Each structure stands twice: as structure tokens, then as C-alpha cells.
């Protein structure tokens with residue numbers, strides 16, 4: 333297990349444009365295309381991202397390429413964020429994957445709402461953090477995925493992603 337296998341479980345893999353849990357056009361392994369309701373706007377984003385006229389379909393290789401870019405960009409965003417970097421750097425590698433998972437799903441702007449959780453994680457109060465993390469729109473809207481990410485922060489193991 334690692335961040336790539338973890339997000340591949342959580343996000344799936346679809347080679348045609350679909351709508352994510354929030355209703356937004358998406359492709360591949362959870363690559364958000366746009367928040368616009370325009371399918372044409374999404375297809376345009378996809379063509380820009382892949383570098384060819386795709387007609388709304390990509391290959392597995394192309395999906396994995398976008399995914400690798402997306403994970404990298406997520407982590408580099410964390411390391412440029414004065415609020416997030418110190419918490420990330422405080423964590424072990426397993427918990428760092430859980431942090432990237434959150435940013436991948438909700439963005440830095442979503443994670444901005446979790447200041448009190450992030451403090452508890454920096455303090456290594458794992459059970460308290462887990463409770464605070466679940467008091468969220470995130471948990472209520474995607475509970476099974478949030479439970480897996482939260483278990484990862486709580487335990488510092490991959491137990492939620494085995495089987």
C-alpha cells in the first residue's frame with residue numbers, strides 16, 4: 333500500500349467522463365474536469381489535459397498519467413502552504429498518505445475547514461483527532477471513504493485498505 337494504491341481504491345477508474353459524488357464532471361482516477369454544468373466545457377478541459385481531441389474517452393495509460401500528475405501536484409501544494417506544511421511534516425508516512433488523500437478529494441480550500449483537526453493531529457492526539465474529523469460535511473457526505481481515511485489517521489496503519 334501507498335498513496336497511489338490508496339487513492340486508486342477510493343477513486344476508482346473510469347475511462348469516460350462521469351459525474352463525481354458532488355455532481356461534477358470527472359474522468360480517470362478522480363480527475364475533476366470542471367465544476368461547470370456544461371459537458372462541452374468538461375470535454376474541452378479533458379482535451380487540454382491530454383493534449384488531443386479525445387471525444388470524452390481516454391486510455392488507462394492516459395488516466396494513470398493524469399493521476400500521477402494530480403498526486404504530485406497535491407503534495408507540492410501542501411509543501412507550499414504555510415498552514416498545512418508543518419502538520420504534514422509532523423506526520424509519519426502512512427498518515428502523510430491520509431493527508432494527501434484529503435487534499436486530493438476536497439482541495440486545500442476544503443482542508444482549510446479542518447484547522448482544529450489538524451492541530452489535534454500535530455499534537456498526536458489520534459483518538460481525539462479522529463472524533464473531530466468525523467464532525468464534518470466530508471464525513472456525512474462520503475462516510476465510508478472518510479471512515480477509511482480517519483482510521484488511517486487514528487492507527488497509522490493500512491488496516492482500512494486491506495481486503
Ligand SMILES: c1ccc2[nH]ccc2c1
Pocket residue numbers: 410416417419420430431432434435443450453
Ligand atoms: C496536510 C494536508 C492535509 C491534512 N489533513 C490532515 C492533516 C493534513 C496535513
Ligand code: NA
Pocket residue numbers: 359360361362363394395396398399
Ligand atoms: Na486520472
Ligand code: NA
Pocket residue numbers: 360361362363395398399400402
Ligand atoms: Na487523477
Ligand code: NA
Pocket residue numbers: 480483484487489490491492493
Ligand atoms: Na488504514
